[PDB]
DNA sequence: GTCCCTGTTCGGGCGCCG
DNA sequence: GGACGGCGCCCGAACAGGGACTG
């Protein structure tokens, strides 16, 4: 017996066009969909269903197995409507329990909104269209409708391990503990056996705003410092640029050396102190969206901020790949998006909306070649001002 | 005959009804054509005579077919189309010959009266009512029982029904390739000719079992096969020729035709250009307005005509070999490319000339051409090509280091064919010793649009220019331009405009702004430019002085 | 807020296919 | 002549954001 589900009032289903797929991904989708159709999990449909949702596939690392992935972001937006200890455990493993969802039927009236279309190489055939009959992987409604079965399944493992923290976010279990990694993996295998029916969050650190150290300062150095401190005062009202700025009176050469007064030196040391204190008055709002901004600092370096209101950052961090003899900005950005989203899920249970510093077309040409999660966050494309890149640079 | 496939259920949009539209006068030749067509369709059950219980009607006509010997019945279903439910179209793109592989045996065949062989949902039939006027004799009323031509549901319902019908055959014959473009079937196989022909007969009997005839008239058995507007020879494909208009006065419609034909030609003709001819359509009034060819458009059209006088062909895809894409630059943001596997044997060609953004440079445009080609390659061949680009590795290295955005080009090798793509100037990372320091600024009054732009310099020089009908952003750009004009080969410039800084920092060499173009010319002239930012109205020295100066008349 | 400037989407011509 | 659907190109209209400004 199914659970009747509805769209949010006044919203029609998704009508998102299918984007080009590589030969590999099409062949994997055709095989996967053949098996799913032969098991009743999906049905071929026609064009009289006006809905569509893009579909692709990802081949997990060192794995010969492909995984189908539906981009249910639009449908999840339109579909009707957290353990603090998880972010503290020594180690956290992420299990892909999405297969379970195919055991539960989907409300017959809702199935039409899960339509998707397999393309073909060189448009040999028209697109081939399916809809779901079961709880789809990637749909907001699947973990919800399944939560009771999930809890009934997990009850005894939780009773026998009260120190373990298990958290569900849509297709995944996040299992965290304080065990030696060998005992930890042994317990994880106990769970993966029980379900026949690696992260280390306490090492995530915050990336503070930092000020240059110099024994000689030019007019240019001080101008730069004063602009950076002026920007930072919006995050930290204690920042003051009175005396440093006082040193810049007149109309001076950029390379003129300015000796720092006592007052200016003390102002600088006080600002260095103030940038240590945590940002005051920043409270997570569940009903609002997490916004993640990323900046390319260059040389494999990336900085990011998670906030909900401007300058009220909930977190600031960095992702720092290595030298980069053959470096791929888009790959590294995709990896950074996945890491930041993983952190957001662990800490708050939401995924962030990403302001991505890339051209839309670059991103859409390549990001699915580096994707490895079963979720996809919302995002948007921004032309960052190089000023903020300089502000967060390390 | 009529396919026994199940019908596709269709409804009208909520709270709407069927068309009630008077039949218009047809000529007698088309009345006779329609009468003969309709008496035969009615004998076959494809249309049914309706009575007075049917309140609906929509106009009918007929036109010649490609085979000029035959007529085609059409219905102006625009009103019923408005009132019909939405569909998800299943034709995702157009197949392309450069994506065909070498096959031992090939057949191209066509379905006879394809639409009229697919049944229509019974509940919907009444909305297809029409009327044949007589050469007065009374005129006969009908409705459709099969798919009509002019209805918006027909193409998708037919393409989907064709796919369902071909599925059992495709399953039994995984290694026979059937390109299915609406009702035209290209069929290729790795069989000897006798066994191929036998398989073709099996395919024809399979279709006939499902109600689709394949008239021999449209059964191509010998090369060159006529397919999708191309000629498919055994080892090369050609495009059936392109006749450009040779008119003397040119209207907007004439230019749309010319540009469409050139774009079509650019899939196999290298070097086609449409920049001038296209910008010649900016802000036009209507299709009939007469545009005079600018001398630039004249020259471009002449070059294209010479290009098109040349003989050219494509080759087929060999999946065991790499795809290579070589890009070439022409001016005004125009690029061409060739995709090939063997050195001088194009699979296809293309052009990219889209103008993205108010301000840009040649490295950005090259990156977006690479992106366009990558996704086109994925559609056609399902894989990404290896690139050959007219840009030195160090140029790209410099840009990817400097550029504050994520940017990337796939596997690529430098190609020494000029015009080489280069950055035309580079901002300094540090202030310059010995170069004068200009503090620049601009103010503009939002009411009067009067403004001022100017600089002070650490060596005591000051200048203020007044401007009419201007904006704050424009005065900031003007102040930068002025400092550039009045400085030596090396110069430090301090601005407070993150607008202007954001523009110049991204190193444009083209812009749609005349002022930004003048600035770019100055930047190219300089040996060294260092451009710093400070916050406005914070009293930072130098900036304070110039802000005071340019605010005098304006704030 | 308003004004300015920039980017994106979408509809309307034309090309091509059936 | 003229009806339909697909894809392509190009351009302009109607949006959407973000940065500077006024007293
Ligand atoms: C060329 C064309 C086609 N169509 C629709 C209708 C039939 C299918 C196939 O086209 P067709 O092969 O030329 O017409 P068809 O009805 O099959 O008849 P035949 O002449 O091939 O026997 O696409 C259309 O609606 N408008 C058009 O201009
Ligand atoms: P649809 O049935 O309109 O497909 C076009 C069909 C296939 C080939 C045939 N054809 C024949 C000839 C002689 C020609 O010059 N062009 C052409 O397309 O029409
Ligand atoms: Mg036909
Ligand atoms: Mg045909
Ligand atoms: Mg200013």
Residue numbers in the entry:
A (entry chain B): 6 to 86, 96 to 211, 233 to 429
B (entry chain A): 1 to 136, 139 to 557
Give sentences from the paper.
Two of the six classes of the United States Food and Drug Administration (FDA) approved drugs for HIV-1 treatment target the reverse transcriptase (RT) protein, an enzyme critical for the replication cycle of HIV-1. While NNRTIs are allosteric inhibitors that alter the chemical catalysis rate limiting step through conformational changes, NRTIs mimic nucleotides that bind to the active site of RT. Since NRTIs lack the 3′-hydroxyl group necessary for chain elongation, their incorporation results in termination of the viral DNA transcription. In this study, we describe the crystal structures of RT in post-catalytic complexes with double stranded DNA (dsDNA) and two NRTIs —the triphosphate form of cytidine analogue (-)FTC (2′,3′-dideoxy-5-fluoro-3′-thiacytidine) and the triphosphate form of the thymidine analogue d4T (2′,3′-didehydro-2′,3′-dideoxythymidine).
Furthermore, the RT post-catalytic complex with d4T reveals the electron density of two copies of the inhibitor. One copy of d4T-MP is incorporated in the DNA primer and is flipped out of the N site by a second molecule of d4T-TP bound in the N site. Moreover, the crystal structure shows that d4T-MP is stabilized in the flipped conformation by van der Waals contacts with residue L228, which could facilitate the excision of d4T-MP from the primer. The binding mode of the d4T-MP molecule incorporated in the DNA primer is stabilized by a long-distance hydrogen bond (3.2 Å) between its 2-keto group and the side chain of residue K66. Additionally, the oxygen in the 2,5-dihydrofuran moiety is in hydrogen bond distance with a water molecule (3.0 Å). The α-phosphate group of d4T-MP is in hydrogen bond distance with the side chain of residues D110 and K220 and is making an ionic interaction with the Mg+2 ion A. Furthermore, a water molecule is bridging an interaction between the α-phosphate group of the d4T-MP incorporated in the DNA primer and the α-phosphate group of d4T-TP in the N site. In the structure of the post-catalytic complex with d4T-MP incorporated in the DNA primer the electron density for Mg+2 ion A is well defined. The Mg+2 A ion is stabilized by several hydrogen bonds with the side chains of residues D110, D185, and α-phosphate group of both bound copies of the d4T molecule. In contrast, Mg+2 ion A achieves additional coordination with the α-phosphate groups of both d4T-MP and d4T-TP in the structure of RT in post-catalytic complex with d4T-MP incorporated in the DNA primer. In fact, the α-phosphate group of d4T-TP is located ∼4 Å to the α-phosphate of d4T-MP, and the α-phosphate group of d4T-TP, acting as a nucleophile, could be attacking the α-phosphate of d4T-MP.
